[PDB]
Amino acid sequence: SNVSVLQQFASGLKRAKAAKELQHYVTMELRSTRFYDQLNHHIFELERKGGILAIASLIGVEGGNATRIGRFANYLRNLLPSNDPVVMEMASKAIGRLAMAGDTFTAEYVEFEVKRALEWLEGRRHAAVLVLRELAISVPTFFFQQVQPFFDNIFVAVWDPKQAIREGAVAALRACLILTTQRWYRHTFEEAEKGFDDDRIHGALLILNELVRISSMEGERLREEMEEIMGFGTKPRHITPFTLVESRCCRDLMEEKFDQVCQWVLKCSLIQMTILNLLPRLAAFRPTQYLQDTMNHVLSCVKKEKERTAAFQALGLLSVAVRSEFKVYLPRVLDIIRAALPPKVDATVFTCISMLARIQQDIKELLEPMLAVGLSPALTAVLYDLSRQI
């Protein structure tokens, strides 16, 4: 559109921008190359979010080409060393899209990015970690090419005094350990124990919980399902239309976790959130001293604010994992729930009520307050699943 194209670009660069990007993608779906490249360069030089969106959309829709890859590789390599937050995540998403495009140069680009990330292992560390996460999720085959340097650099870079680096690197370790288990463990456990022996608290807990959760997926399945929250006998139409190491070290994991949960009770919110997330899975693997240590922190955080959602989720996972011994603290849980409802966040409360049901005739008397709370899709789903299971 030349003039109109440049106008639309300037408008998108200056909700509305998202709609503009969507319209551009829809237009590219139908559909000059030099004009498109010049427009991309004009948006790129000027703002950065619009340029990244345009580049990623055109690459994804028009299809990866050698000329396009060669021309946009320079832009991507210019964006990475220095940029602004949020824009960095969008650039990482564009990189992941280019990696998952599936071209000949994809292997070379992935190897280049992996080597640069390993050299790095702060707009450089976080971008490298995001790229590594995207490549591990998208291309496990080329992500497994470098494993020993990956672990060696990460086990040193993780324990640096940073927050976003920890959050990204924990997920990258999650992906790497899942890939390894599907197809190191001693080195990972040794590094986690050395780090554990307030910054070096949640990282070791996460590393140990990785082995615990990969060994036992039963606890993770419930959490994943709650985060998410025809027939074979039908006659087809007569006219067819056109168409081991994680088990022997899990004990030590729970041991190191039960102490860290009791120690870092209120040290440096983020640590409390991580402990609340990780304790229920550890208890699900192996439930009294561990159970008491978990329950103390869980009950302390439930009464407090800013953690009620995760604390209640951990409480529900504990109730599922521990059936008999958990019955002692049922009155406290019920009193806290009956206290939290009258203010009306409570959607997760209903979800955890469903998990606890996942029973007694006291639920008949509990029906009135939850119904009096109000309408919400989570409450409806909870009632439907309760009528299903029981």
Curated annotation (Swiss-Prot):
Autophosphorylates when part of mTORC1 or mTORC2. Phosphorylation in the kinase domain modulates the interactions of MTOR with RPTOR and AKT1S1/PRAS40 and leads to increased intrinsic mTORC1 kinase activity. It is found in: Lysosome membrane; Endoplasmic reticulum membrane; Golgi apparatus membrane; Cell membrane. Expressed in numerous tissues, with highest levels in testis. HEAT repeats lie at residues 1-31, 32-64, 65-102, 103-139, 140-180, 182-216, 217-239, 253-287, 288-323, 324-358, 359-390. It is linked to Smith-Kingsmore syndrome: An autosomal dominant syndrome characterized by intellectual disability, macrocephaly, seizures, umbilical hernia, and facial dysmorphic features. Focal cortical dysplasia 2: A form of focal cortical dysplasia, a malformation of cortical development that results in medically refractory epilepsy in the pediatric population and in adults. FCORD2 is a severe form, with onset usually in childhood, characterized by disrupted cortical lamination and specific cytological abnormalities. It is classified in 2 subtypes: type IIA characterized by dysmorphic neurons and lack of balloon cells; type IIB with dysmorphic neurons and balloon cells. The kinase domain (PI3K/PI4K) is intrinsically active but has a highly restricted catalytic center. Serine/threonine protein kinase which is a central regulator of cellular metabolism, growth and survival in response to hormones, growth factors, nutrients, energy and stress signals. MTOR directly or indirectly regulates the phosphorylation of at least 800 proteins. Functions as part of 2 structurally and functionally distinct signaling complexes mTORC1 and mTORC2 (mTOR complex 1 and 2). Belongs to the PI3/PI4-kinase family. Part of the mechanistic target of rapamycin complex 1 (mTORC1) which contains MTOR, MLST8 and RPTOR. The mTORC1 complex is a 1 Md obligate dimer of two stoichiometric heterotetramers with overall dimensions of 290 A x 210 A x 135 A. It has a rhomboid shape and a central cavity, the dimeric interfaces are formed by interlocking interactions between the two MTOR and the two RPTOR subunits. This is Serine/threonine-protein kinase mTOR. It comes from Homo sapiens (Human).
